[PDB]
Design a protein around this nucleic acid. Structure first.
Lengths: 141, 103, 145, 143, 63, 100, 61, 56, 206
RNA sequence: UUAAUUGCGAUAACGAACGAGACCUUAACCUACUAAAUAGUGGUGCUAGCAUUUGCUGGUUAUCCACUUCUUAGAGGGACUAUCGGUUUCAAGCCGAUGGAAGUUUGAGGCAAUAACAGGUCUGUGAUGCCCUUAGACGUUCUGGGCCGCACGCGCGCUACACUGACGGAGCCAGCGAGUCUAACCUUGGCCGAGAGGUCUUGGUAAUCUUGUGAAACUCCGUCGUGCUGGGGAUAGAGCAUUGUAAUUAUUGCUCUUCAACGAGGAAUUCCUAGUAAGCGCAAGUCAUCAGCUUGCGUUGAUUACGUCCCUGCCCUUUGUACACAC
């Protein structure tokens, strides 16, 4: 019966479910520690929520996120958005607003899609070409 | 639509009988690269590579003219000796610098 | 620290199986220039005869050279699988053969002549010098003669 | 903390296992795994040779723990690569079943994995015990 | 090469047959209050500063 | 006596009508039940060319079947299988009653 | 562009010439008012008419 | 038992067959429409024509 | 400083980067300036970003591409020649290695060196095509500074990749060397030679 | 002024009608109503290990409780360019900033007006007029060939011309869909096999089993090295099986072996403005067997345009015609 919040995270096709709840600072993703997400380069991208505002907010709660769908970079963007939205959900549900508003302002100042799902989605393709807009080669004579 | 001028049998045969290019080959001659680490290629490596501020496989093959394979064990030996300090480690590229007296 | 300097053990040119093979390359891939032997067979022979897979070709000693030589000469008595021969179930003899640099061309000419003599369709096509295996020559093949 | 393979780095786990069974030498090598291709899409036989079978066994022993139950067909599907069918484009081709089956029989004999219902196989009690035990040393090795 | 940094205030319009050249009226901050008409190849908006090599090179409508 | 009624058809409005009528009929008395579960829509695609022969542009269409499935579960004594069996079937709508 | 179609223009002027006491300067309330009174088949159509009437109210105030 | 998609396809083919064969047969009567309502027990097929005395 | 190691073990460099600005974890985003003010408002130095791989819609508007990070612009521009499409992780890894070269040689901030080279090899005067009407005659036209940035970055990318083509030297090291030469003003850089040639063409057809 | 005969306007015109528009589908948003063991989520039991602590990773329907945030619609709401600063006969409309899931009619499709083509089709139609034949028939059927045949010339595409690479290991994530009851389909698990595959079994008429289709492009470790080399396996010889009554002109797959041209492609020419191009793979179509094709889907995902009629073309008005099958 411990208070908790849940949210979603999507980039283009990946859904990440979050279970942000009070804890001692558990941070692992998919049951695996945050140090293992996949890129060894974009590793800092999922860290940015940890660093933009500070680890004190993460100290009093914990995040359990399960992501499914998409692939690789879409995956990591999905967990990034999911953890950001879960933290902000616990912020506006069980946390003082004076920190939540400043946190949201900093998040939006850094990048808009932290709390907003990306609007770019795949579109149907058309006949006469491999791609949606690129048509097949047509030669005269 | 004007009719197509059908070629005669002999004309078609002559046109198809004819049915031969070349290559510029502007690349320079192959660079003779050593495949065995000899004593003379050992002593120069031990002597002069502390001078370079930037050490890498490409630099080593370009200047000391040894095989790229032997280059890797050479850098490993230098790393074990501590004469160079690494900066970034990767399978496709290794970044080493001279061991300066500072830091 | 694995740095070695021999005063001299490297042979510039070796004479395995009537071919002029140079050095400066790995011994595992040195047996690719011999006709009838490729990369996989070379690696298989190297790992079967424990010839230090990660080693160059020129500075190869004569004992292991002779070992490589006789394992070219015959693979059968050394429990090699029958899957690795180019003349499986030979027509003339019946024992699987692995005809080699001086033998692959002779055997190819031999069965080509057999097909020509039996007046086979494949033999007559090969004699004509043309596609023999279900190939559309309407648009394929222009720089031949 | 708990120190489990889910909390263990994948490559560190693989190297630690490749050291561990290579050192102990109790895996039942079938003896024929030295020249096979392990896939029709592959081009070269194994290069490591000595540690190849042990690397494969470590990988699978990781895989059954990560999943619930995984069969030889699923393992073949995941191991198989894209075959260069000459001028024709690439396509996904399943790996070799015999070597993988010998690997699963090897863990069956050793005691890492046992039989499981609903198809596939599931990690054994001793298998999970050793999987979580090796995590300890492979963590304080880098700690 | 004597350069002159000059900031634009009014794009006249797109000139040229292919429409790759845009006319603009531009002046320079250093000793301002005198302006010249220049032609820009790339996309130019207001309050954009450009490096002119030339000073007495009043241009003309392109074709 | 577990009675399940599976409803299948293209007409979504007709399916909603039948499902609502069945839900009201089962709500009559008590007959505890679960309401409408929404299965994913099974769009069936058939790709054809406009021109019967080879002349013309390479025009294609994808004709679509839009079938809907909505099954309702019921659990009660032998009364329910006689007071629900009455058939409210309309054109285009298919029902299947399965026991146990 | 965003040029209003003559049909929505006629609907908007008919609304303006008849329901001035009903029409207000707030978009949502007069959109609901159009929902009640004007029998429009499609939500996008009636919403476009409501927006046009709001613009006309702002202009002719 | 036939799958749901194939059963619906077969029902559509049934309707098309009935429509075509009625357009072929009920010519002089001006066949206008058919309803193929199905009830598991008894299937009912209703017909509309302008001279139903000739249908009967 | 915050030494908090809450629950899951987290490397100290993470808190080190969290303390100050994004820093790229190695390269101080501050202490980076720009050249003459004509090139400002198109090479930003006031928006630190952790990783040089993003998914922004920089092409939605005319000047949304101007707000794209300069190092991100280099990462994107390196991604061409067909088969090298995608693999932005590989691209940004190559740029990270390039920044390593830039720090190793003539020690300076890699972003500052990149900005200096971008400003240095900027075509300040380019010709345009004009309809012949009897004879093909060109005309000399000034260029936008965003256009100058585009030409500069394209020149570096193509010149470095062509130098690295069919060569033992890696793309990262070759492009870092080309960047260092362009920043230093040496005439050996392909971008510098092409910029000088375009300048001479434009001055000739005055 | 608009993409629009789209509107404001003026005005021998008025009322109008088709089209565009309008309309429908799909792609995103909903902590809002309905929920759902053919999807789950959190807790309660058995419960494996580590920790020993309270906790972590898990599995397990007749072991239960709560819920729909995530998975799916049903009915609905929402974006109408809303607010602001402007520009604007200052009317339509247009330019920038804000909130914003969504601001070029939000993106893309479906339908798509009059009139015409001597455009394609009697080789889709038991829909066909006329002409030809009707009993060694141009009907049907059987056997073998043929559509693949080879001096060559062209158009759609695939593979590469290597280090941003090639090869071997490992981490390795999706969507569209499809599937057999008297036909024999997807196949799961075990076993026998390098592999191709074979056998014994498992589930499925379908969110329930294939399937989370654990796909590739990717990422990280190693080998190679600027050599037509470890890129290329095109052309070829031998053997092993599957599909097929019937594989010879090899259907196809599998193992070895030969490793040819290609070192960036001139005259000229094709597609494209953002989940776009491009790179990569997957499902389906024909299918006893056979994708380098097509129809759709998914993954990584640039740069450059925010303009024009200079080339190729299109719409309206004026003018000239000796054009009318109309240059």
């Amino acid at each position: 019966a411990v208070p908790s919040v849940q949210t979603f995270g999507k980039k283009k096709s990946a859904t990440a479910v979050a279970h942000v709840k009070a804890g001692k600072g558990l941070i692992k993703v998919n049951g695996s520690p945050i140090t293992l997400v996949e890129p060894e380069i974009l590793r800092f991208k999922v860290y940015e929520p940890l660093l933009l505002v500070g680890l004190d907010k993460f100290s009093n709660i914990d995040i359990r996120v399960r992501v499914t769908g998409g692939g690789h970079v879409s995956q990591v963007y999905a967990i990034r958005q999911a953890i950001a939205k879960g933290l902000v959900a616990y912020h506006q549900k069980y946390v003082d607003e004076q920190s939540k508003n400043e946190l949201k302002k900093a998040f939006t100042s850094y990048d808009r899609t932290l709390l907003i799902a990306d609007s770019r989605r795949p579109e149907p393709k058309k006949f006469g070409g491999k791609g949606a807009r690129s048509r097949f080669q047509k030669s005269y004579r | 639509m004007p009719p197509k001028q059908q070629l005669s049998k002999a004309a078609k045969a002559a046109a198809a009988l004819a049915g031969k290019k070349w290559s510029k080959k502007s690349m320079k001659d192959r660079a003779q690269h050593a495949v065995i680490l000899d004593q003379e290629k050992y002593d120069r490596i031990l002597k002069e590579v502390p001078t370079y501020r930037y050490v890498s496989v490409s630099v080593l093959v370009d200047r000391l003219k040894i095989g790229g394979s032997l280059a890797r064990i050479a850098l490993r030996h230098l790393e074990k000796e501590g004469i160079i300090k690494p900066i970034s480690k990767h399978s496709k590229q290794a970044i080493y610098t001279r061991a300066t007296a500072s830091e | 620290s694995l740095v070695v300097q021999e005063q001299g053990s490297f042979q510039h040119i070796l004479r395995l199986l009537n071919t002029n093979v140079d050095g400066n390359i790995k011994i595992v891939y040195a047996l690719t220039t011999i006709k009838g032997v490729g990369r996989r067979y070379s690696n298989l022979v190297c790992k079967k005869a424990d010839v230090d897979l990660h080693k160059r070709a020129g500075e190869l000693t004569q004992e292991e050279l002779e070992r490589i030589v006789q394992i070219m000469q015959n693979p059968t008595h050394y429990k090699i699988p029958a899957w690795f021969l180019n003349r499986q179930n030979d027509i003339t003899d019946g024992k699987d053969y692995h005809t080699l640099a001086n033998n692959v061309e002779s055997k190819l000419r031999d069965d080509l002549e057999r097909l020509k003599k039996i007046r086979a369709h494949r033999g007559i096509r090969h004699f004509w010098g043309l596609r023999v295996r279900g190939q559309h020559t309407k648009t394929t093949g222009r720089r031949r003669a | 903390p708990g120190v489990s393979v889910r909390d263990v780095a994948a490559q560190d786990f693989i190297n630690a296992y490749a050291s561990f069974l290579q050192r102990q030498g109790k895996l039942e090598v079938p003896g024929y795994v030295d020249i096979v291709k392990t896939s029709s899409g592959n081009e070269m036989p194994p290069q490591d040779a000595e540690g190849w079978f042990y690397k494969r066994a470590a990988s699978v022993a990781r895989h059954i723990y990560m999943r619930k139950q995984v069969g030889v067909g699923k393992l073949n599907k995941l191991y198989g690569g894209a075959k260069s069918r000459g001028v024709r484009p690439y396509k996904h081709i399943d790996a070799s079943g015999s070597i993988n089956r010998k690997v699963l029989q090897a863990l069956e004999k050793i005691g890492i994995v046992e039989i499981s219902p609903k198809g596939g196989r599931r990690i054994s009690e001793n298998g999970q015990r050793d999987l979580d035990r090796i995590a300890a040393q492979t963590l304080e090795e880098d700690e | 090469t004597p350069v002159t940094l000059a900031k634009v205030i009014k794009v006249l319009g797109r000139t040229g047959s292919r429409g790759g050249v845009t006319q603009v009226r531009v002046e320079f901050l250093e000793d301002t209050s005198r302006t010249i008409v220049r032609n820009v190849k790339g996309p130019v908006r207001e309050n954009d500063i450009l490096v002119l090599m030339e000073s007495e090179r009043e241009a003309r409508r392109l074709r | 006596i577990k009675i399940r009624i599976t409803l299948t058809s293209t007409k979504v409005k007709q399916l909603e009508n039948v499902s609502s009528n069945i839900v009201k009929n089962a709500e009559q008395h008590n007959l505890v039940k679960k309401g409408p579960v929404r299965l994913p829509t099974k769009v069936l695609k058939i790709s054809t060319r406009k021109t019967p022969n080879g002349e013309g542009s390479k025009t294609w269409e994808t004709y679509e079947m839009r079938i809907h499935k909505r099954y309702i579960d019921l659990e009660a004594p032998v009364q329910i299988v006689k007071r629900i069996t009455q058939i409210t079937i309309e054109p285009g709508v298919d029902v299947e009653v399965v026991v146990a | 562009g965003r040029v209003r179609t003559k049909t929505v223009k006629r609907a908007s002027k008919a609304l303006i010439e008849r329901y001035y006491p009903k029409l207000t300067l707030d978009f949502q309330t007069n959109k609901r008012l159009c929902d009640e009174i004007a029998t429009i088949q499609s939500k996008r159509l009636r919403n476009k008419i409501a927006g046009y009437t709001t613009h006309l109210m702002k202009r002719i105030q | 038992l036939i799958s749901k998609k194939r059963k619906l396809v077969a029902d559509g083919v049934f309707y098309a067959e009935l429509n075509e064969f009625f357009t072929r047969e009920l010519a002089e009567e001006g066949y206008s429409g058919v309803e193929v309502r199905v009830t598991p027990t008894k299937t009912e097929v209703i017909i509309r024509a302008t001279r139903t005395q000739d249908v009967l | 400083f915050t030494p908090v190691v809450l629950a899951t073990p987290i490397p100290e460099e993470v808190q080190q980067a969290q303390t100050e600005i994004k820093l790229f974890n190695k390269w101080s985003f501050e202490e980076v300036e720009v050249k003459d003010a004509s090139l400002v408002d198109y090479v930003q130095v006031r928006q630190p970003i952790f990783v040089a791989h993003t998914a922004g819609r920089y092409a939605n508007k005319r000047f949304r591409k101007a707000q794209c990070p300069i190092i991100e612009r280099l990462t994107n521009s390196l991604m061409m020649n067909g088969r090298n499409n995608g693999k932005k992780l590989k691209a940004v890894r190559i740029i990270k290695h390039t920044l390593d070269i830039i720090n190793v040689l003539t020690d300076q901030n890699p972003i500052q060196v990149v900005v200096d080279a971008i400003t240095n090899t900027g075509p300040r005067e380019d010709t345009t095509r004009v309809g012949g009407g009897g004879a093909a005659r060109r005309q000399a036209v000034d260029v936008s500074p965003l256009r100058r940035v585009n030409q500069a970055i394209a020149l570096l990318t193509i010149g470095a990749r062509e130098a690295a083509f069919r060569n033992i030297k890696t793309i990262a090291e070759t492009l870092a060397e080309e960047l260092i030469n362009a920043a230093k003003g040496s005439s050996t850089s392909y971008a510098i030679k092409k910029k000088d040639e375009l300048e001479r063409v434009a001055k000739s057809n005055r």
